[PDB]
């Protein structure tokens, strides 16, 4: 990473890891980061080698020595001029170096989250809540899993106050493993989603693994309208818990939904009050409610909560309103599944002008559901749908549809739309890896 980073010395690294200095050549200067691309390492880092699926960072360990880096960690001695912790399993090393550091920096509160949806939104609403108070680390992208979530760890600093770590996890067993490096004051689950094995049991049941690690007078986070809400506040039944959602703890009324915002009333143990939310969509106000609800756990008062909340900014490629006069770009391209794609449509309907939606393919799925979505979304008041993809056709089964099998031959069609027509107001969608934001931002250069 690039940000400011603490050092690490020799003794740090060989204390969290157990490790041993090869040949006993102890580097006599610290340590100022640890990474795990070769591309990148230089003089002072320490070169962490991991292996994995078909891959193995021990064989570039000669390359990290031409770029001058004197400092590596690694499995298995290896015949070069650099000083090497030998280790026997580099991935669970790397795991802990974050948990010594999260210990090491002991003045912290800290909150994990996990859910099936909503999770890097509830976690940017954190970070602004918190970091209006005091230095906060978030976890950024998508370092949410077993290598992802120490890496973050590394990043912590003494003035840090606050941690809010997002766990991605879907799998049996993944979610204490990263839990148990973070060790959470403040835990829970935003949502149960659609089914990936196991089923949604399955994603429950993973999930609940959050609860476990949860510290001595810590608090258990539970979503009070959810499927799998009972279940859930079993599994969190060994802490104190609070609740979000209606019938819970922390709820919202008189929800009113405004073009790129949203207002409502905010009832808590802690008292009531009114929000206007600078997010758009029914979601936003359930992830806003999510977070006040962690946000109260740790102490902070309803005060701070909403003044976090009114000042909070979302995530790149999450409903992104990006005014380009006469012209309004929405850009929604982060990801995509049948259900967020009419979600997303019902945003566009707000919008003034001639409403555009482009939209790419919905992954993981297929034909069917396309044909269906093609279909719902044909029924709605939109002025013209653009679809993007290998499955458009099925899209176009069930004047106002068009379909593109690539974004190359759709471009123009978006150009002759602005000519045809006035302002136009676009929204832009598709599952992560149609990169639907290279369509956008193609059309936005003229
Ligand atoms: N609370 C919610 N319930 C249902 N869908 C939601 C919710 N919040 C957001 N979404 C949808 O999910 C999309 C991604 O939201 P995001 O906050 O990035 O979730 P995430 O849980 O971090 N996803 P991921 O890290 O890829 O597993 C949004 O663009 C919405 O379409
Ligand atoms: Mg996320």
Redesign the pocket.
């Known amino acids: 990473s690039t940000v400011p980073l603490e050092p690490w010395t020799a003794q740090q690294l060989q204390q969290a890891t157990q490790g041993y200095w090869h040949k006993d050549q102890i580097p006599q200067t610290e340590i100022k980061r640890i990474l795990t691309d070769s591309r990148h390492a230089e003089s002072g880092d320490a070169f962490l080698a991991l292996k994995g699926e078909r891959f193995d960072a021990h064989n570039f360990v000669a390359q990290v020595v031409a770029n001058g880096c004197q400092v590596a960690i690694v499995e298995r001695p290896i015949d070069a001029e650099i000083a090497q912790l030998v280790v026997a399993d580099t991935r669970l090393a790397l795991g802990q170096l974050g948990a010594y550091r999260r210990e090491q920096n002991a003045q912290l509160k800290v909150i994990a989250l996990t859910?099936?949806?909503?999770?890097?939104?509830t976690k940017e609403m954190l970070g602004s809540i918190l970091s209006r108070l005091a230095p906060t680390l978030i976890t950024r992208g998508?370092l949410?899993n077993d290598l992802g979530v120490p890496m973050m760890l590394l990043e912590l600093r003494k003035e840090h106050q606050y941690a809010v770590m997002?766990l991605?996890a879907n799998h049996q067993g993944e979610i204490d493993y990263t839990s148990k490096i973070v060790q959470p004051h403040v835990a829970g689950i935003?949502?149960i989603g659609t089914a990936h094995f196991g089923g949604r049991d399955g994603i429950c049941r993973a999930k609940s693994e959050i609860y476990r690690h949860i510290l001595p007078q810590g608090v258990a986070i539970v979503p009070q309208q959810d499927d799998f809400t009972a279940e859930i506040r079993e599994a969190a039944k060994s802490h104190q818990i609070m609740s979000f959602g209606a019938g819970g703890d922390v709820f919202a009324t008189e929800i009113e939904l405004l073009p790129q915002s949203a207002n409502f009333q905010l009832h808590t143990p802690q008292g009531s009050s009114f929000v206007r939310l600078p997010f758009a969509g029914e979601?936003?106000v359930?992830?806003a409610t999510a977070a006040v609800a962690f946000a109260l756990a740790l102490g902070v008062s309803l005060e701070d909560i909403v003044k976090g909340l009114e000042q909070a900014q979302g995530?790149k490629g999450?409903?992104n309103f990006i005014q380009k006069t006469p012209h309004l770009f929405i850009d929604?391209t982060?990801?995509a599944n049948p259900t967020?794609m009419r979600?997303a449509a019902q945003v566009l309907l707000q919008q003034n002008g001639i409403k555009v939606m482009v939209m790419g393919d919905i992954g993981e799925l297929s034909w069917q559901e396309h044909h269906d979505l093609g279909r719902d979304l044909a029924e709605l008041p939109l002025d013209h749908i653009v679809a993007v993809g290998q499955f458009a056709s099925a899209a176009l089964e069930g004047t106002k549809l068009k379909a593109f099998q690539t974004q190359a031959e759709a471009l123009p069609f978006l150009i002759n739309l602005i000519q045809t027509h006035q302002s136009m107001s676009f929204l832009f969608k598709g599952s992560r890896f149609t990169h639907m934001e290279t369509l956008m931002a193609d059309l936005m250069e003229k």
Request: hydrophobic share 15%; no cysteine; proline share 0%.
């Open positions: 859910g099936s949806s909503g999770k890097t939104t998508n949410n997002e991605g935003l949502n979601h936003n359930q992830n995530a999450r409903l929604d982060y990801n967020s979600a």
